Nucleic acid binder design. Structure first.
Ligand code: SF4
Ligand code: MG
Ligand code: MG
Ligand code: MG
Ligand code: MG
Ligand code: MG
Ligand code: MG
Ligand code: MG
Ligand code: MG
Ligand code: MG
Ligand code: MG
Ligand code: MG
Ligand code: MG
Ligand code: MG
Ligand code: MG
Ligand code: MG
Ligand code: MG
Ligand code: MG
Ligand code: MG
Ligand code: MG
Ligand code: MG
Ligand code: MG
Ligand code: MG
Ligand code: MG
Ligand code: MG
Ligand code: MG
Ligand code: MG
Ligand code: MG
Ligand code: MG
Ligand code: MG
Ligand code: MG
Ligand code: MG
Ligand code: MG
Ligand code: MG
Ligand code: MG
Ligand code: MG
Ligand code: MG
Ligand code: MG
Ligand code: MG
Ligand code: MG
Ligand code: MG
Ligand code: MG
Ligand code: MG
Ligand code: MG
Ligand code: MG
Ligand code: MG
Ligand code: MG
Ligand code: MG
Ligand code: MG
Ligand code: MG
Ligand code: MG
Ligand code: MG
Ligand code: MG
Ligand code: MG
Ligand code: MG
Ligand code: MG
Ligand code: MG
Ligand code: MG
Ligand code: MG
Ligand code: MG
Ligand code: MG
Ligand code: MG
Ligand code: MG
Ligand code: MG
Ligand code: MG
Ligand code: MG
Ligand code: MG
Ligand code: MG
Ligand code: MG
Ligand code: MG
Ligand code: MG
Ligand code: MG
Ligand code: MG
Ligand code: MG
Ligand code: MG
Ligand code: MG
Ligand code: MG
Ligand code: MG
Ligand code: MG
Ligand code: MG
Ligand code: MG
Ligand code: MG
Ligand code: MG
Ligand code: MG
Ligand code: MG
Ligand code: MG
Ligand code: MG
Ligand code: MG
Ligand code: MG
Ligand code: MG
Ligand code: MG
Ligand code: MG
Ligand code: MG
Ligand code: MG
Ligand code: MG
Ligand code: MG
Ligand code: MG
Ligand code: MG
Ligand code: MG
Ligand code: MG
Ligand code: MG
Ligand code: MG
Ligand code: MG
Ligand code: MG
Ligand code: MG
Ligand code: MG
Ligand code: MG
Ligand code: MG
Ligand code: MG
Ligand code: MG
Ligand code: MG
Ligand code: MG
Ligand code: MG
Ligand code: MG
Ligand code: MG
Ligand code: MG
Ligand code: MG
Ligand code: MG
Ligand code: MG
Lengths: 208, 122, 96, 82, 99, 137
RNA sequence: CCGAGGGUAGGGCCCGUGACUGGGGCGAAGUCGUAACAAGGUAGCUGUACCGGAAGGUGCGGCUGGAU
RNA sequence: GCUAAUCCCCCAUGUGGACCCGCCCCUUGGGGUGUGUCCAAAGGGCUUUGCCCGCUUCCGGAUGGGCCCGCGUCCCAUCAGCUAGUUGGUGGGGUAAUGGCCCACCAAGGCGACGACGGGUAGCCGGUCUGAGAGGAUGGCCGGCCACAGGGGCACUGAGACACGGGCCCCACUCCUACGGGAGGCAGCAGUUAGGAAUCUUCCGCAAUGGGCGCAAGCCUGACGGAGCGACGCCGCUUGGAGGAAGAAGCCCUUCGGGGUGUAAACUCCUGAACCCGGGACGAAACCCCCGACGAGGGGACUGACGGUACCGGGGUAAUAGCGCCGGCCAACUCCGUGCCAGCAGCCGCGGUAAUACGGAGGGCGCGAGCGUUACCCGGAUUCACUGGGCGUAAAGGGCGUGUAGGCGGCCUGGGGCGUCCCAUGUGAAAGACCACGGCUCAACCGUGGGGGAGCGUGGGAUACGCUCAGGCUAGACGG
């Protein structure tokens, strides 16, 4: 399945802060705050010029590792976006963001997507009433993404939902806290989200 | 050529010559070792490369490479072969697959074990 | 190791007999009239030729002759006889 | 003879028929003469049955023969209503 | 409809049969240039009224013989010995093309 | 002389390239029509039916751009590019739907249609195809 | 009568194989000389012919893709 | 040797059809009519002077076909000439029907550089894979057509077969036998063996769908619907989530100060794959029965292989990770061992005592129930170049004329309208493909709707260009 391993080393390699844990990501116990250099024996040696290929690989891995998604599903989504009408970059990011485990995280149901996945998977989430335990479900405009009322009395979701009381949620989303439910308003612009990612470089990678 | 010349003679699509004739359409071919020896490579290399002469089910008799450090192959050794030449060994167009039939895997191999037919160590 | 295919085979040999029987009889009387007509002998030709036509259409009741084969056979018979009697004449009866 | 019946389409444990006019001697899912409606025995959708009633009556008139459970479905579309 | 073809009578050495050469043009499927191809049809001439060099129309017809599937329909032009000669000159050139 | 049309296009190409005022091509009705289009689209100043030593010709008046600065002061051509498409060796015909767009519209395709010699724009308006004579830009 | 095929005889094509034999490719750690690349120590190359352990030579005619 | 019938036969009846000849219409043998001649039949069952199932002749419909035709359909010209039923005719035979399909005679024809004949390879298509497109490759699975049923020939029965599980014969092979004689045909479903690198259960059910027979009940159905095995392929899912030290041990590197694996572990909380118990389908309403009329219509029941499965509810355990690679192409570097050895290698190249290239280790990169390898197809390959290449010296101008076929062709006018262009129209099956919506929790998969196209048939139109026919011209060419 998913990467399921050490996650700080990912940000370290990627040279940027990816927020893959939630809480510690903002603490001084964050690794990017302590050691902002690539993992392993050679982290502190001086980098030589990355090749063009090198550059585009990394930009793609960044985007990937953000969502904890397989290269397979990633590539499929990309391939969908390329043949899909309009502009590939936006559509790709849009489709990425429409993943259930992702929406569950963007709505603050969880601190990380990893946790969001386990939430979705363990059926603690529903879509328009119906239970959906598939992280890959494509949420469409007008969908109600709620906590399972049979799971609403869960510590973790509470502490997380407590943290969301008036906390802003992207323009494309709306959260009704206390009711433990949210809605998907429309598919997000590249503009409407500020990923540390030039998604053109991803296009260029898959055109090789 | 003129357009008329093309109408008359056309363009010629040239077929590719297989580098693995003894395989006769197949990914692999089983065979039996007749000669198992060492062979010295050409310039600028120097070695005693391990090689078996194999008699295939495809009716061919060819020389195949025995990759890896050490082997247990001898006369009458049953053996599976695959394509792939050894550039420095003229006439050697195939590789014996380690870990098939009478070909042992490489002893104490640790890296790249699937290519050398070695099971995962405890 | 057995079937009603056996039954079907038995039946075919009995239907076989009857088809040949009728077909032979038709062939006999056909050429017969034609022979008479040749040396015609008009009344005798037509008399036999009337009998051939009957056996023909009668064959086409069942599986022996297809209607078109019957039609074809009658046509050639009558065509042959008339053309033969035309060397001498005269047609003493019908038809036609 | 020429018949009006159900050619199975769809997939495993997801039966979806096209009610169809074809020669009886055809294979069940073979080339058919004309499609005159569909049928979804599981009612997974609002309209799980459609029948061009106009065309169906023609085939009936010209000598076609419905299967039993086709005639059932053909009844539900009121082809036999006088 | 029955196919109707125009061509020259290049042989009448047969009883009640003439040989009609027919030509057609078309663009080469790949190289685009327009090219000529011809074909000889055996034509039914029940009156034996068709002479060498006649431009005629033949129409697709029920089989008359093995290879005869066309009747001559009508005369179009006459005395085209100039065409007949191009057919014959080529056949004549073939002895030069052996070994 | 196997292709009068290609000879004319070539007579022009050779002349413009060394910046002649005009050039003479042997005259024909079909050539006039092509020049008619060439002028009305501004590739040439125009033409006139003249006579050379007793023979009907077409004098084609060439047009260029302004003198340029720098090492090479020769002016940009107005006709950068002109070449035959359909040729005696291979006739090229398109239907109205196959009519090309020369240089994204910055250029023209000349075609002979059963409504006469037209540009690709014109042919598309009238909705007819024809033989693709040449392309200019 | 025709007729699967069988039999007799004689041809044609293709494949595998054969004492032995011809040259070829690769190998290279050998023997002989050094033909070509410099005017390569006889300018070279060339078709042909004759000749020599070998590279090659010479004749006849040709080319310059020959140094001075 | 007996005996029935929807078995066979004869006679009648002739609505009508069949055939000969004449006539009209037509125009290949299409329809109509006149004399003659010829041909019909079967009964069964109920609730019984009425029904239902059948039977008979004839027209038609619909469906499914046969035959024929134009065009398209691979490699070798180191295959260049092929042909006696051969090509045509007349007459017969044969068929449902045209035809040398078959026969008899008459004539001497038929085909070929636009590739006959011969050799090799191949079932063809819808499609499929690739590709910017053009094109290339391929035709298994599904659909359509063809061909075959151990090898070969043959006809019989029949609406239809020259018939996979029908007949006859010959051959090869195998088996049974009581040794006299007999039997067989998995390229149906499973299964065995052999061959191979390699390819499945001697499973369940007719519940659905479909087929045969039956008035109906119903019977049959290895079609089919399903279950089994195989990471074979694609799709979905798990092996946990949060917190957690300037950071344990172990291992690796170290200039000995330290760096690394690494929030990684431990540890804490939280969730709860698996499993446990409880419920439990959709796929199935028709045939039928009853009222109506055996119809229209209305009510009535019977029935699930998969399956106690999916799925719903209750509980509930932190719960498999591996494979390739890290010289350049190409993303990932260090220590040791080795010392042109052992070995690596797709190409270039690595290895001779400080090897980022061999072997291990630490570390890193890339994918993840997969990862790599071999094989093959298209791509990159404008490296067969139509789109889209070349030939002084790189591979490439024929030693040179002459000329056959063919390809190509000057200026003006008109006819025709062949190419070519335009419009209308028929055809372009379904599946697949593309856009949209929808159904299985998503996806894969599947359903529903939408838009085309070339190509060819037909009808009408256009005439510049190319073609053709006709008439002029002199600028090319030839002649004086
Ligand atoms: S902590 Fe810093 S490093 Fe570790 S995941 Fe959150 S952001 Fe990346
Ligand atoms: Mg963030
Ligand atoms: Mg850059
Ligand atoms: Mg796009
Ligand atoms: Mg924002
Ligand atoms: Mg961010
Ligand atoms: Mg690409
Ligand atoms: Mg063997
Ligand atoms: Mg070396
Ligand atoms: Mg052994
Ligand atoms: Mg290889
Ligand atoms: Mg490895
Ligand atoms: Mg029976
Ligand atoms: Mg007798
Ligand atoms: Mg009959
Ligand atoms: Mg004839
Ligand atoms: Mg072109
Ligand atoms: Mg014989
Ligand atoms: Mg014989
Ligand atoms: Mg015999
Ligand atoms: Mg030898
Ligand atoms: Mg010398
Ligand atoms: Mg020397
Ligand atoms: Mg010298
Ligand atoms: Mg010499
Ligand atoms: Mg000698
Ligand atoms: Mg000597
Ligand atoms: Mg000498
Ligand atoms: Mg000399
Ligand atoms: Mg000379
Ligand atoms: Mg009796
Ligand atoms: Mg009677
Ligand atoms: Mg009965
Ligand atoms: Mg005849
Ligand atoms: Mg028949
Ligand atoms: Mg014949
Ligand atoms: Mg004869
Ligand atoms: Mg004779
Ligand atoms: Mg031809
Ligand atoms: Mg050829
Ligand atoms: Mg063969
Ligand atoms: Mg084959
Ligand atoms: Mg390309
Ligand atoms: Mg094929
Ligand atoms: Mg296949
Ligand atoms: Mg198939
Ligand atoms: Mg056979
Ligand atoms: Mg057989
Ligand atoms: Mg067999
Ligand atoms: Mg047999
Ligand atoms: Mg019969
Ligand atoms: Mg058959
Ligand atoms: Mg069988
Ligand atoms: Mg059978
Ligand atoms: Mg049989
Ligand atoms: Mg037995
Ligand atoms: Mg027995
Ligand atoms: Mg006995
Ligand atoms: Mg016997
Ligand atoms: Mg058996
Ligand atoms: Mg089998
Ligand atoms: Mg086996
Ligand atoms: Mg075996
Ligand atoms: Mg099996
Ligand atoms: Mg199966
Ligand atoms: Mg059933
Ligand atoms: Mg049934
Ligand atoms: Mg029935
Ligand atoms: Mg009853
Ligand atoms: Mg049975
Ligand atoms: Mg069964
Ligand atoms: Mg099945
Ligand atoms: Mg699986
Ligand atoms: Mg520290
Ligand atoms: Mg640390
Ligand atoms: Mg430590
Ligand atoms: Mg430390
Ligand atoms: Mg953790
Ligand atoms: Mg719970
Ligand atoms: Mg049910
Ligand atoms: Mg009812
Ligand atoms: Mg039932
Ligand atoms: Mg239960
Ligand atoms: Mg539960
Ligand atoms: Mg608990
Ligand atoms: Mg744990
Ligand atoms: Mg790799
Ligand atoms: Mg190095
Ligand atoms: Mg790579
Ligand atoms: Mg690198
Ligand atoms: Mg050693
Ligand atoms: Mg390796
Ligand atoms: Mg060293
Ligand atoms: Mg060392
Ligand atoms: Mg390497
Ligand atoms: Mg190494
Ligand atoms: Mg997967
Ligand atoms: Mg390739
Ligand atoms: Mg190409
Ligand atoms: Mg070209
Ligand atoms: Mg080139
Ligand atoms: Mg040239
Ligand atoms: Mg050269
Ligand atoms: Mg020359
Ligand atoms: Mg000449
Ligand atoms: Mg000429
Ligand atoms: Mg010409
Ligand atoms: Mg012209
Ligand atoms: Mg004209
Ligand atoms: Mg005109
Ligand atoms: Mg025209
Ligand atoms: Mg169309
Ligand atoms: Mg379609
Ligand atoms: Mg849906
Ligand atoms: Mg399209
Ligand atoms: Mg038309
Ligand atoms: Mg003229
Ligand atoms: Mg002159
Ligand atoms: Mg002169």
């Amino acid at each position: 399945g998913r990467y399921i391993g050490p996650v700080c080393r990912l940000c370290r390699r990627e040279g940027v802060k990816l927020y893959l844990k939630g809480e510690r990501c903002y603490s001084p116990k964050c690794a990017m705050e302590r050691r902002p250099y690539p993992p392993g024996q050679h982290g502190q040696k001086r980098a030589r010029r990355p090749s063009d290929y090198a550059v585009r690989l990394r930009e793609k891995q960044k985007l990937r590792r953000i969502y904890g998604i397989s290269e397979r599903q990633f590539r499929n989504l990309f391939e969908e976006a390329s043949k899909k009408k309009g502009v590939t970059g936006s559509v790709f990011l849009g489709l990425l963001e429409s993943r259930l485990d992702n929406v569950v995280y963007r709505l603050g149901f969880a601190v990380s997507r990893r946790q969001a996945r386990q939430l979705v998977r363990h059926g603690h989430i529903t879509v328009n009433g119906r239970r959906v335990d598939l992280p890959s479900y494509r949420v469409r405009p007008g969908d109600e993404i709620a906590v399972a009322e049979k799971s609403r009395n869960l510590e973790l979701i509470r502490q997380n939902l407590e943290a969301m009381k008036g906390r802003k949620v992207g323009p494309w989303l709306s959260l009704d806290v206390e009711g433990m439910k949210g809605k998907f308003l429309r598919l997000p612009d590249r503009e409407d989200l500020a990923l540390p990612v030039n998604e053109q470089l991803v296009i260029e990678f898959y055109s090789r | 050529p003129t357009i008329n010349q093309l109408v008359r003679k056309g363009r010629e699509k040239v077929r590719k010559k297989s580098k693995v004739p003894a395989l006769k359409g197949a990914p692999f071919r089983r065979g039996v070792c007749t000669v198992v020896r060492t062979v010295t490579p050409k310039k600028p290399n120097s070695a005693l490369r391990k090689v078996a002469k194999v008699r295939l089910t495809s009716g061919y008799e060819v020389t195949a490479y025995i990759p890896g450090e050490g082997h247990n192959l001898q006369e009458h050794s049953v053996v599976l072969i695959r394509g792939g030449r050894v550039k420095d060994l003229p006439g050697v167009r195939y590789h014996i697959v380690r870990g098939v039939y009478d070909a042992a895997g490489v002893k104490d191999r640790k890296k790249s074990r699937s290519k050398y037919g070695t099971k995962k160590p405890k | 190791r057995n079937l009603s295919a056996l039954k079907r085979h038995r039946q075919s040999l009995k239907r076989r007999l009857r088809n040949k029987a009728k077909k032979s009889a038709i062939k006999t009387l056909s050429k017969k009239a034609i022979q008479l007509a040749q040396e015609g002998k008009a009344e005798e030709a037509l008399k036999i030729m009337r009998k051939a036509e009957s056996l023909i259409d009668k064959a086409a009741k069942g599986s022996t002759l297809h209607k078109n084969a019957a039609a074809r056979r009658k046509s050639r018979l009558m065509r042959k006889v008339r053309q033969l009697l035309e060397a001498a004449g005269a047609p003493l009866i019908g038809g036609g | 003879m020429v018949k009006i019946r159900l050619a199975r389409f769809g997939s495993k444990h997801n039966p979806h028929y096209r009610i169809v006019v074809t020669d009886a001697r055809r294979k069940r899912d073979g080339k058919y003469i004309e499609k005159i409606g569909y049928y979804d025995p599981r009612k997974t959708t609002p309209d799980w049955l459609k029948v061009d009633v106009e065309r169906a009556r023609y085939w009936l008139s010209v000598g076609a023969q419905p299967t039993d459970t086709a005639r059932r479905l053909l009844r539900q579309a009121g082809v036999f209503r006088q | 409809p029955k196919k109707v073809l125009t061509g020259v009578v290049v042989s009448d050495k047969m009883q009640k049969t003439v040989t009609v050469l027919v030509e057609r043009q078309f663009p080469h499927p790949l190289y685009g240039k327009v090219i000529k191809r011809s074909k000889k049809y055996l034509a039914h001439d029940p009156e034996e009224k068709y002479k060498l060099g006649d431009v005629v129309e033949i129409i697709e017809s029920r089989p008359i013989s093995k290879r005869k599937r066309f009747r001559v329909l009508r005369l179009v032009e006459s005395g085209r010995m100039d065409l007949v000669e191009k057919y014959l000159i080529r056949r004549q050139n073939y002895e030069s093309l052996s070994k | 002389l196997t292709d009068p049309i290609a000879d004319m296009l070539t007579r022009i190409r050779n002349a413009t390239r060394v910046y002649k005022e005009s050039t003479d091509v042997p005259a024909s009705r079909f050539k006039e029509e092509i020049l008619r289009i060439l002028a009305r689209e501004g590739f040439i100043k125009g033409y006139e039916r003249v006579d050379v030593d007793g023979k009907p010709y077409l004098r084609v008046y060439l047009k260029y751009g302004p003198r340029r600065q720098g090492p090479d002061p020769r002016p940009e051509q107005v006709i950068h590019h002109i070449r035959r498409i359909s040729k005696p060796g291979r006739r090229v015909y398109v239907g109205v739907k196959e009519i090309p767009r020369v240089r994204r519209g910055l250029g023209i395709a000349i075609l002979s249609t059963s409504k006469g010699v037209l540009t690709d724009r014109e042919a598309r308006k009238l909705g007819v195809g024809g033989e693709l004579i040449c392309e200019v830009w």
